[PDB]
Known about the structure:
With 595 residues, this protein is mainly alpha-helical. Strand 9 (421-422) and strand 10 form a beta hairpin. The longest helix has 29 residues, at 289-317. The protein has a single domain (1-595), classed as Myeloperoxidase, subunit C, CATH 1.10.640.10. Helix content is 34%, strand content 5%. It is globular and about 75 Å long. A two-stranded antiparallel sheet has the order 1-5. A two-stranded antiparallel sheet has the order 2-8. The protein contains 22 helices and twelve strands. The site of a molecule of 3 linked components (NAG-NAG-MAN) has 5 residues, from helix 9. It is found in: Secreted; Cytoplasm. Keywords: Antibiotic, Antimicrobial, Calcium, Cytoplasm, Disulfide bond, Glycoprotein, Heme, Hydrogen peroxide, Iron, Metal-binding, Nitration, Oxidoreductase, Peroxidase, Phosphoprotein, Secreted, Signal. The record marks 255 as: Transition state stabilizer. Belongs to the peroxidase family. XPO subfamily.
Amino acid sequence: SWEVGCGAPVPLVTCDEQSPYRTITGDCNNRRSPALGAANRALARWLPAEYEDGLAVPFGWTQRKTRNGFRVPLAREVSNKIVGYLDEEGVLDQNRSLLFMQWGQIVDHDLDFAPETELGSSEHSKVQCEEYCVQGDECFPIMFPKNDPKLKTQGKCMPFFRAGFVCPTPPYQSLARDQINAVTSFLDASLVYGSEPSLASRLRNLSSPLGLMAVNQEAWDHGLAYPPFNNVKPSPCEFINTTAHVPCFQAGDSRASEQILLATVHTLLLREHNRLARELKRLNPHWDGEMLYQEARKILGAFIQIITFRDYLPIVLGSEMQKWIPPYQGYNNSVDPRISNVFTFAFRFGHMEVPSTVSRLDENYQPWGPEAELPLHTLFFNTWRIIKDGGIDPLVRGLLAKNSKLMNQNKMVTSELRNKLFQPTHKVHGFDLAAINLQRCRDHGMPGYNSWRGFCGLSQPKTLKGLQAVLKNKVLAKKLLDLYKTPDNIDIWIGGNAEPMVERGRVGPLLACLLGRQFQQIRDGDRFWWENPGVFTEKQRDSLQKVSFSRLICDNTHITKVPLHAFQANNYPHDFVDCSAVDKLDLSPWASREN
Ligand code: HEM
Ligand SMILES: *[C@@H]1O[C@H](CO)[C@@H](O[C@@H]2O[C@H](CO)[C@@H](O[C@@H]3O[C@H](CO)[C@@H](O)[C@H](O)[C@@H]3O)[C@H](O)[C@H]2NC(C)=O)[C@H](O)[C@H]1NC(C)=O
Ligand SMILES: *[C@@H]1O[C@H](CO)[C@@H](O[C@@H]2O[C@H](CO)[C@@H](O[C@H]3O[C@H](CO)[C@@H](O)[C@H](O)[C@@H]3O)[C@H](O)[C@H]2NC(C)=O)[C@H](O)[C@H]1NC(C)=O
Ligand SMILES: *[C@@H]1O[C@H](CO)[C@@H](O[C@@H]2O[C@H](CO)[C@@H](O[C@H]3O[C@H](CO)[C@@H](O)[C@H](O)[C@@H]3O)[C@H](O)[C@H]2NC(C)=O)[C@H](O)[C@H]1NC(C)=O
Ligand SMILES: *[C@@H]1O[C@H](CO)[C@@H](O[C@@H]2O[C@H](CO)[C@@H](O)[C@H](O)[C@H]2NC(C)=O)[C@H](O)[C@H]1NC(C)=O
Ligand SMILES: [C-]#N
Ligand SMILES: [Ca+2]
């Protein structure tokens, strides 16, 4: 191999060795190997990278060069021919709330982020990629095929910059390109507390010794908090309505404002922290701020794991859950906690669960005003609809009352995502998330579909008839091969999502496998898992088993009617109960009795 230790912005420090608290960076989780699982290191590889030049050039870069003998089809074309649909009727998941979608994006943002290459602060490279669609260094444009309506209207391509890689970020050359993960691999609520020490400090309110998180001083939501505005300008959130001039929210993660519902749950998590921090002061008045913040931070993270593994994963993986995530047996120092590259694509199954509209409901769960129901596209980087149009209560009710989009082989990704995506850097509402994913798959050097089928010990179709049988769909199998020419070349993202769903889950055989393995590893390899003996006490754990998202809603909003089981489609009011019927989190076990 080569250089068993490359790396940059890898910061400060080494282990307090006996501290009861996680680092912010993720360091010191594992003792023998302290960097394992930290932020700003390469995504792990379960299989060797597959580039056009075996080193870094993505398949589809140089156009005389084929992959296994054939030209790779354009990203946008695979989007246009296989991913899109018009009829939004009957596309909803009859047994999964919109919260099911939303929680996936959170967990996801807790685990991974491969940021786009920068080297662009007063640059025209950003422009050479935007204005001329010139493929070059880090610019790897998504061209439009002939007859694409976007030609007549936007340009010749959609800009697109490659993701960042390890040793440097400028050119480089020596070995195989590995993409960076800028967040910690552990399910540790980093999307709330940050993954950098610098950032994590800024988010805190270090004026009062109460272990609180910095909150907004310009706007309030019925006496309830809002995360602070981010003051970098230009601001994406400002651009979408210059008259309101409302900036994006500032949070542990940089994506918090990407879409209105993600910002919403970001606020719930911010509010639960401060809530905990002051409930913990009540009980332990001697405690100093640092201890409040840290104990609060520990409880909250405990919260995100419990919800994720008890309530979310079982209805995603389904009958495939037990196969991959057997019951807990304690921490295993030999297990690699790092998020694999391919995961960052397998976990994108969620993109096909995002419905076309977002609704605001009143106190009786009725349409909130004349413009209650909004197009998803008008909500990307939209924070003014929250601050200036209702607060989060109308949105939380939407989450609870409305359905997610069911994945459908004939209706994959909604046009609001496939045709009208807003990107922070740019100005237009016309990017394609489906096309970007596909392009990105090649950017990261993903192996194909069959290499992954194999990895997981499933069959590897080689023929139109073979794919037919796997996909249980003739027309899909036919469209897929007309474009890819062989099942070997199909991109992991679309290839994985095209499979029929497993019994009682929301993904198929190949996806269940990739997702399962990863989640089994972050749990078995995390020294601070909430169930691991020593982290919490008998008594503390016992109380933690009682948490639920419904409760999270009750303590932190003015919604008084909620479902018991928030992840499944619930109807109002039959399925809704009073918050007073919902198990609370008993923090008595956190009291420290003296002398
Ligand atoms: C708008 C977007 C969403 C909803 C309205 C949305 C939703 C999800 C869900 C529900 C996911 C999982 C259950 C999920 C996973 C991942 N996404 Fe993501 N998403 C919206 C928009 C975007 C955009 C834009 C990107 C950037 C893609 C790129 O490569 O440039 C994006 C990415 C991802 C992603 C990769 C994260 C990473 O490792 O960098 C997921 C794992 N989503 N989305
Ligand atoms: C940009 O953002 C502003 C919000 O700052 C949006 O303006 C809002 O527009 C509506 C009407 O178009 C105003 O509401 C009106 O009055 C009452 C509500 O009290 C209602 O009953 C009426 O039917 C009507 O809807 C609202 O007050 C106004 N907000 C302000 C203070 O300007 C605007 O629509 C956004 N424009 C863009 C570019 O999206
Ligand atoms: C909508 O999704 C619901 C959420 O998963 C689902 O509820 C699930 O119902 C089954 C009932 O069979 C439960 O699974 C267990 O049931 C019994 C225990 O009574 C066991 O003997 C079984 O082996 C199995 O372990 C789940 O507990 C329950 N899921 C959750 C998370 O609550 C509904 O059935 C779905 N509704 C429709 C219409 O399909
Ligand atoms: C850091 O922590 C500070 C201490 O909690 C916090 O200051 C407090 O801010 C609240 C809310 O803005 C104020 O409480 C309320 O005051 C009257 C009620 O008497 C209301 O009319 C207000 O609207 C408000 O809800 C307190 O006045 C204030 N506490 C003190 C003693 O100054 C800071 O806001 C926190 N800083 C950040 C950036 O989050
Ligand atoms: C911790 O997990 C590891 C990793 O799976 C397990 O290690 C296995 O150990 C056996 C010998 O006992 C070897 O044959 C395999 O190489 C390992 N499994 C694989 C495929 O990685 C181990 O079971 C766990 N250790 C403890 C103490 O629970
Ligand atoms: C994710 N966006
Ligand atoms: Ca994390």
